[PDB]
Symmetry: D2
Subunit: 406 residues, 4 copies
């Protein structure tokens, strides 16, 4: 009845009675998946074992032997079922967008922390990870840098995940500021995407256990969001933050005075936990998986595991849309229309919902604290593709739609 | 090789002839209306065919004679290619949401003018027009009422269409205020508040007189509504102009702050502004206007291009963040849909790529938003993965009407 | 025992040991006290001197009989003048300081004549006048002190004083606040912040003489300013009034906003009140007549050159308090701290200035600084308090090196 | 030309010898206290004369001269009704009536944010007067120690301006009411020295360079001069509680440091400590009234004659007390009362009637704006009765009475 889906896929990769391993790997990579994709491990484990047998071809039987455990995911890849079918074409566009933004040399590397915010201004990296796990990187995408305020969406998602929308917003608002004292009309910080809200959010997570276990908890959570790619910690940055955090201590003592914390909070300990979270290191590549988890409804696209509740992800994307780019948030929301969160190390965590996640990193910031190259890339991207939140999917004038074939 | 009309014919038959009522009943179940302008040739031919009797049955060749001219649309309709395939199931959910909000009898009918205070608190209508022209109304959806601030996205869309983003926003901002009148640049905060709308009004069709400015807008609103009802309440306009002290304060303040293009007659612009607020619609015709905004600027029941994609994207963005007065931030967070409320009780609602809607009930909550409409919008999104930041693949237990199963 | 008459006592002081006093010698001695022979309180004495001067061809010598005859009806005021009982006893010396202060402020030629209406733009920037009227009626002017100009916002304390005079403190402040704003139309009770800014002045205007028409209201205020000015010059610039009404978009915005917020007494015709407000801004004074108005405020509401009670002590105290904190636009806080005098500036370049218990002054020069205050006048105010212990919180017993013109040596 | 001693002697012995009690009784009726530091030589010689009895309790012209000669100028001013309030006993009667009227105002809440303030009885109420000539009057609980709290804010600003001048001090602090927490005005300075942010900055200007123990002693020595060496103490219990519960003040201090509002070389956390100490300095109504009298008298302490503050310091302090001294009530207090005043959370109101007298009113129960209810009531009543409003007129003042005039 059914010519096995393995056999079907074998005769679309051949046409020619055996398939060399290199030709299978090359074709796989042209789909956008990496050979290292964790959902492909059994297939790659079977390829490693078959290759050990001789100093290397593949009949229909050996092909079924290697692909049968992952045949569904491989088929969607090879039959152009992914969110961006023509990924190689899309990748060329990202590279042009990267090169155009590389010429933008304005901005100043933040210097308030000595601790390696002596980063080179020429550092510039862009990483893409689609909701189906297709990957592309250009530039300095393996270099660790601190999330800084890029961590704010992530830890708010964690808190809404563990505690729910209602409890979290007992303590922090859900709206942009006004031209920004610290607290809105209900004497809550305005939203989780500014320092006061992030500090209150930090006090909500894993209450009860000590700070060392809270950090372990958040790290394990970030690991799931990144599909177990690079997450780390900059103790140097942490020490800088805690010695130069005069504004944050002011916020902390103010929040404590206005009774903004859940009962039982040690505010100075929370501030320390806050500085730790800002000092978490990612790379562009690992951070883009984190964004793609947000783009994919809370499922990590390269592992398939449910990481956040959909309520946590919708809420996070909403507040990233309106509050994520500091004083530029209103203009960014209007011209780019994408959930994004910037950080003072030069990172912009960018989310194209249902499509892809991205991390852009260039240390030189503009006057509002946003990476100059990153802001430029974001504008170009949406000017090229119909990814703006309120672009139309049918009628989009000169823009390109990478979700489509023609 | 075999004809599209025949394939469609063989789908509706099973049975060498299709009864006419069978064809019509199947067509309406898709959600298209018999009166759809894109179906006029089909329906005229059906009407003419029945006159020249010879019975009431359509064989293959007669079927081809009738549907030939609109075959593409009739097939997208019949092959379940529309944005909401199981439209009748969705329709029944709309009615449920309608009946829930009907019971929310709270709020106060606006009474700063006699025309608004006249309206019964119990008038409540909801109308739906998808981006493919599928229609559904429940309640008081053929009762005329004034757009009031619901016109503000529409005239801004007209301004961006004729003038572009960069020009228009020399005069008006693009953010919620959070709080007045002017932002840090001495511009009104956004086009969705009186000060910004008054300035947007002064950008439209500069040079010509007010009668021609108005007719230019009315003809524009007619295209957005697929030529359904757009009218004018002179009674409301006269009351607006004699009780709008606040609006006169804004207008003089704008003139003092030099907020208008050079050559503006501010009191004339205020008059034009009051006229735009007094334009009348029904839920049904306003829902087509919203659907045009849902459909990238093409009117879904006529196929006509009305607005630039740029105008539509801008308007949706500012409706999202600024369209529900002091509730805008909470609406964006919990509903996540572009919407615009007005003091007559209307909420102009857009679900991008899906549909436009108009909800109307005169009683307002103390933020100025129709109580029944606010309740309906929350219910709608609690039920369907329509929130701007819902996910289209993983959406918990929400219903997705774009799908079949 | 009995009485050697006060008239004869005074005659001997003026008659330096001689038999008769020539009339010119009496006038010169009188003028040296600071009083003007035209002082309304001295009219009988001057009438009698004029009658005596009629009997003779040229000049007359006054014996004690003729002296008592001319002087008897005003002998008390004349005795205080001549026995140095006036608030500034050595007025000639003080007058020389005012002239020095005047001359050095004359050199401050910066600022910009207001030009939002043509009438204000036409005034030359070198017009500069300063006039002093003490609470005892001693007068001094230097510069362009008889040139009419519009009170503009300088009228704001005056109509507020009229409203408190007629209506009381509690009623008036149902409608307007009593504090400086800081940073925009209404305070937290939805009242204009104070009567010294446009919104509060417009509301104050709607409180005065309600129920009669605008023409009768203006006559009423005009008569009131005449009393405050001791019947010196008060007028009206219809040209300024017309330009104000056609140019004041900000004031129309304010009036529509106040109407919206229900800031007016019930029954107010708001555009009619705006018209009345433009009229009040267009009232004309000179430095000399305006200094008498200031001196009425310095003197607890008694006009010092007529002795008539013009305003209640309550109206005057309220007015001086709000001029102190709110009278110099955005510069009020600095002016209160460094000058410490109730003052009120206007866009024509006037600064109505009060030294309570001492004197009133009008300084006028059209060129304004970026805050709307006359450059020369502001310079003069600072100099005056650098020189004399007139600051609100200068101490009257220990004031270090400042002069105190109230004291003899 | 007869001698001032003899002239005064005749004025008192209407008749060849004055009894001592008669001299003392007439002296106290001028309002001067027999303990006045300016009268010590007179008082010392009087008691020494009583020891060597002889004549009895009777003073002749030569004994009177021996006793009063060293203080004759002051005693003559007193006895010849030349003090600023000549009929002091009558004025005293009015103060008493005003006191009793405010005593019936039992509203308000004692501050409870630290236990030291919470333990004070609501019914404590005292009012003390010291004129610029040293005339003294007290009614109620005027010998009960309480903390200055924010009443110290004008006193340390006055010290700062005295030592450093107006221009330097106001590089760091503004000179106007705020009207609109905010913390900072447009120039990124605290609005004025009468609010916590400005006071904290002013605290950081005094005796820069020396340690906090020496800064504190410098200030205490300064307050003791203002108070004519009457009680100035310290509540370490209040200080401990202040620093343990001053979250808001730590917020301000870190914000101030973030915005670079301190002089360079400032240890903000140590300045916060010094600030809590200044708030914990103790006075009584009687000694605090002398402090306010010093401000009333252009910087001279009226019961010692000592120059304590420059006139510049005093004028600045009185100006900012006028417009900024009663928290959110400042604008209304300036309009209706028109007197320089400073309230504090322990119930004190430091009150200055310039050229006339200083006062301290104290009652712990505060109103919703932080001001003592009985004290606010007394200040209104005082100015309703007397032409002491800054913009009252000294010649035409309606039905008010002027205690400076005789009739
Ligand atoms: N803006 C950022 O990226 C955060 C920087 C730093 N951790 C702060 O809290 O201010
Ligand atoms: N909210 C509204 O619908 C406003 C309408 C009304 N005409 C106004 O301009 O205020
Ligand atoms: N400062 C002024 O004198 C302004 C007066 C002017 N007529 C106005 O109402 O604005
Ligand atoms: N406000 C006061 O008078 C004292 C309390 C104030 N919180 C302080 O700094 O001590």
């Amino acid at each position: 009845l059914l010519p096995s889906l393995e056999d079907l896929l074998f005769y679309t990769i051949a046409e020619q009675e055996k398939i060399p391993v290199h030709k299978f790997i090359t074709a796989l990579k042209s789909t956008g998946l990496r050979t290292s994709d964790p959902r492909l491990k059994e297939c790659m484990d079977m390829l490693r074992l078959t290759l050990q047998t001789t100093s290397v071809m593949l009949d229909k039987d050996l092909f079924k032997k290697c692909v049968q455990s992952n045949i569904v995911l491989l088929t969607q890849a090879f039959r152009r079922k992914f969110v961006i079918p023509d990924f190689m074409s899309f990748t060329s566009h990202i590279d042009e967008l990267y090169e155009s933004a590389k010429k933008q040399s304005g901005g100043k590397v933040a210097d308030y922390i000595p601790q390696l915010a002596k980063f080179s201004p020429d550092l510039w990296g862009v990483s893409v990870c689609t909701v189906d796990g297709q990957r592309h990187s250009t530039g300095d995408t393996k270099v660790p840098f601190c999330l800084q305020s890029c961590v704010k969406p992530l830890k708010y998602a964690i808190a809404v995940n563990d505690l729910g929308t209602e409890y979290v917003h007992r303590y922090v608002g859900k709206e942009p500021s006004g031209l920004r004292l610290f607290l809105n009309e209900d004497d809550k910080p305005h939203n989780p995407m500014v320092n006061a809200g992030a500090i209150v959010v930090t006090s909500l997570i894993k209450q009860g256990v000590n700070n060392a276990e809270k950090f372990d908890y958040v790290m394990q959570f970030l690991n799931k969001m990144a599909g177990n790619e690079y997450v780390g910690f900059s103790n140097a940055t942490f020490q800088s933050e805690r010695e130069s955090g005069d504004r944050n201590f002011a916020i902390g003592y103010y929040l404590k005075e206005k009774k903004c914390f859940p009962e039982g909070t040690d505010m100075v300990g929370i501030l320390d936990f806050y500085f730790q979270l800002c000092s978490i290191e990612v790379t562009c590549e690992s951070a883009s998986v984190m964004a793609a988890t947000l783009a994919n409804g809370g499922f990590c696209p390269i592992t398939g595991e449910r990481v956040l509740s959909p309520e946590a992800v919708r809420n996070t994307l909403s507040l990233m849309h309106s509050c994520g780019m500091w004083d530029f948030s209103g203009q960014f929301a209007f011209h780019v229309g994408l959930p994004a969160k910037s950080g003072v190390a030069g990172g912009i965590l960018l989310v194209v919902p249902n499509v892809m996640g991205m991390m852009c990193w260039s240390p030189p910031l503009d006057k509002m604290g946003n990476s100059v190259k990153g802001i430029h890339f974001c504008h170009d991207l949406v000017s090229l593709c119909n990814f703006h939140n309120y672009d139309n999917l049918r009628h989009f004038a000169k823009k390109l739609d990478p979700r489509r074939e023609g």
